[PDB]
Structure 1
Amino acid sequence: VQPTPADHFTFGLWTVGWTGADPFGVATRKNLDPVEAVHKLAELGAYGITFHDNDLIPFDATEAEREKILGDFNQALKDTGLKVPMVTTNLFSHPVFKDGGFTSNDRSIRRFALAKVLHNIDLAAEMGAETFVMWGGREGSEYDGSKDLAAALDRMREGVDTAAGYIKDKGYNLRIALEPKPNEPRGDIFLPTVGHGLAFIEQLEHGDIVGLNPETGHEQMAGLNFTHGIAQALWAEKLFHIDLNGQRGIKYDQDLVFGHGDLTSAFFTVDLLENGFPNGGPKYTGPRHFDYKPSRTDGYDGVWDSAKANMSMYLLLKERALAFRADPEVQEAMKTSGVFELGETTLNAGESAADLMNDSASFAGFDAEAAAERNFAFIRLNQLAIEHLLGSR
């Protein structure tokens, strides 16, 4: 498996660029020049690169420097042909954002945070980004009395709707994608899972251009099924972007290589992204973005091995998932378990609630004890998937 730009594999500048400082220690690697990053990613088969405003342009940088940095950055995009599909803003690193960007208790920080996002939408448009991600990493609290919970959501809505209306007013060809996270760095983050993110978007004025940017590790920190989560995002037509990585359990966010976390769940994620639904339905056609961090124990060879590893892992899984669905033993097992049977409507065309109630065969003369004898054979179906995954079928 060798990735090619047609695979649509994008990487964030901060991923490979992650130097190793964790809470208990300092960087273990030297800074990675962004132009070096572009050249190396492009040679590995990457289609595009994403970044946070401050990943490329320092917070203090003068206008001269911004322009200098951008010019070299754009040259490298040109030299290689790497695209920039998604742009995001850093509203969490600087001490000013310690209580949040949009939901900062301080009004002057909320205005600063929002102006930072508005300027960043202009650079996104300029770069050719199709998606603008918003990860509200410091929106939340450690203590329950720190915030007025309704005001926190009024304030989150106000910023997202202001950013959304601004895209609409300039006619930028951009969608906003919100990224849910249960905790870390805040004790409790607002919009903690895919569900809260999706619900939130239905209360927005400009909801039509606001979707989600779910991350594997993030849902797994709440012990949720990532494939069930993305399935619901997809079903709602809100799966706008995706961040792929690995996590081994409910603990700090590990940010491992995709596939180095929960392997079986990674296989079913690849099956949904690549194959979609068994009865047919929506499909996710966007970039396959890897949002991970190369372990601080490894040197730069490990950084480039790690980036290669995301792509191979995904291609190995895809192959196994195409073999699995194409298998006639599997398709027949699927039939036995009712996968296709779930696809038929419960009610007959034209039947009503009154009709169903009063139909003796569906209720009053229904043999519940006979219907309960059905062997759904979910275990055997699950064993077929694992054997395809182990490359044994």
Structure 2
Amino acid sequence: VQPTPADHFTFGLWTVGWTGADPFGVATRKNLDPVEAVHKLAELGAYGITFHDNDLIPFDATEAEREKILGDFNQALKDTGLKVPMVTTNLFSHPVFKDGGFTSNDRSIRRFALAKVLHNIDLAAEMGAETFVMWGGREGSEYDGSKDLAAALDRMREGVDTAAGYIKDKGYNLRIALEPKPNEPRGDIFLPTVGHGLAFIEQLEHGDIVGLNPETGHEQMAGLNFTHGIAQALWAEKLFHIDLNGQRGIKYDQDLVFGHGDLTSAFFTVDLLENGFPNGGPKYTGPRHFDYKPSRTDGYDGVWDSAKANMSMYLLLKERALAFRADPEVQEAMKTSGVFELGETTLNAGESAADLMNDSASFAGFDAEAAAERNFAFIRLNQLAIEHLLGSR
């Protein structure tokens, strides 16, 4: 199980560079030089790297420092071949953003947040990124009277449509990906799930270049089925990027390695990315990005190991999910369970609503108790899946 650029494993600079400070303690690891991260990631088989403007350029950086940091960084990229598929903005660590960027109650802040974002789009554009990620981490509240919620969504729309309008105006080849999160750091975050993300998109003047960046753990924090969520994003064709990691339950964002959380769920996420839908449909073709944090208990050896464990986990799952769908016994079980059957339209070609209600056989004379006798055999189909996952069959 050896990854290759062709695999499109991307990693966030803030991921391997996470030095370990959490809400109850300080960093356990020294800062990571961006040039080193670039080079280690290229020796591991990474395809690209992503970052937040302030991951690379300090908030207070002078112009001379900015040009230098970027010289060093492009030099590393040049030298190693890594791509920069996604760039994002940090609208959350500086105290100024304590109430959000786009949806801060303070107009002056909303303004700086949008400016900071427009500048970052130029940068994203220079770096050759295809995706522009928005994570509205400080957008929300701890109390229900803190905000006029209709005004918070108007404000969100203004910021996103302004960013998108500008992409169109500058002719950049960028798509905006919204990344939902239910809570943390705010008690309640706006656009908390994939569903809320897709909904909002549809209210946008420029929603056509706006899509989603679901994160495994974020969905699991609301106890939702991450495979079901991304399938909704796919079906609507708004799956522009994905963030893979592991979560063990409803609690703080753990950001474990992909597959170190809910494993069967990881299995079916891989089946979906790789194999697609059993009856066919859109397939995801973007970068497979890992947004995790090397546990603070581990030193730097652990850090490259966890980077490596991401890609292995994906590759192992990939192998199992291909075996799985390729097993003849699994294809038969599927057919039995009606998986292919769900793909057949309900109505007959040119059958109307009226046509159906008066069809006796479909209703009036339909024998409901006999139909109810079908053994769907979903347990056995489940068992086969598990046996493929365990490398048992």
Tell me if TM exceeds 0.5: yes
Aligned-pair distance for 1:4?
A: 0.2
Aligned-pair distance for 1:137?
A: 0.2
C-alpha distance after superposition, 1:99-124 (max 9, x if no partner): 00000000000000000000000000
C-alpha distance after superposition, 1:8-58 (max 9, x if no partner): 000000000000000000000000000000000000000000000000000
Aligned equivalents of 2:367 and 2:67: distance in 1? 75
Aligned equivalents of 1:365 and 1:282: distance in 2? 38
Aligned-pair distance for 1:152?
A: 0.1
Aligned-pair distance for 1:289?
A: 0.0
C-alpha distance after superposition, 1:168-199 (max 9, x if no partner): 00000000000000000000000000000000
CA RMSD after TM alignment:
0.2
Aligned equivalents of 2:280 and 2:328: distance in 1? 18
Question: What fraction of aligned residue pairs are identical, expressed as a percent?
Answer: 100
Aligned equivalents of 2:86 and 2:311: distance in 1? 18
Aligned partner of residue 11 in structure 2, secondary structure? strand
C-alpha distance after superposition, 1:253-298 (max 9, x if no partner): 0000000000000000000000000000110000000000000000
Aligned partner of residue 314 in structure 1, secondary structure? helix
Aligned partner of residue 145 in structure 2, secondary structure? helix
- Which residue matches 1:375? 375
Aligned-pair distance for 1:125?
A: 0.3
Aligned-pair distance for 1:129?
A: 0.2
Aligned-pair distance for 1:311?
A: 0.1
Aligned equivalents of 1:363 and 1:202: distance in 2? 37
Aligned-pair distance for 1:81?
A: 0.1
Aligned partner of residue 87 in structure 1, secondary structure? strand
Aligned-pair distance for 1:148?
A: 0.1
Aligned equivalents of 1:237 and 1:364: distance in 2? 39
Aligned equivalents of 1:26 and 1:197: distance in 2? 33
- TM-score, structure 1 as length reference: 1.00
Aligned-pair distance for 1:142?
A: 0.1
C-alpha distance after superposition, 1:324-354 (max 9, x if no partner): 0000000000000000000000000000000
Aligned partner of residue 93 in structure 1, secondary structure? coil
Aligned equivalents of 2:82 and 2:222: distance in 1? 35
- TM-score, structure 2 as length reference: 1.00
1:66 aligned onto 2:66: yes
Aligned equivalents of 1:282 and 1:361: distance in 2? 35
- Which residue matches 2:42? 42
Aligned equivalents of 2:135 and 2:252: distance in 1? 17
Aligned equivalents of 1:182 and 1:299: distance in 2? 31
Aligned-pair distance for 1:93?
A: 0.1
| Count of paired positions | 393
Aligned partner of residue 185 in structure 2, secondary structure? coil
Aligned-pair distance for 1:378?
A: 0.2
Aligned equivalents of 1:281 and 1:176: distance in 2? 23
Aligned equivalents of 1:200 and 1:220: distance in 2? 21
Aligned partner of residue 387 in structure 1, secondary structure? helix
C-alpha distance after superposition, 1:184-225 (max 9, x if no partner): 000000000000000000000000000000000000000000
Aligned equivalents of 2:253 and 2:68: distance in 1? 35
Unaligned residue ranges in structure 2 (runs of 5+): none
Aligned equivalents of 1:239 and 1:63: distance in 2? 36
Aligned-pair distance for 1:240?
A: 0.0
Aligned equivalents of 1:372 and 1:254: distance in 2? 43
Aligned partner of residue 115 in structure 1, secondary structure? helix
Aligned partner of residue 323 in structure 1, secondary structure? helix
Aligned equivalents of 1:29 and 1:285: distance in 2? 35
Aligned equivalents of 1:148 and 1:47: distance in 2? 43
1:9 aligned onto 2:9: yes
Aligned-pair distance for 1:70?
A: 0.1
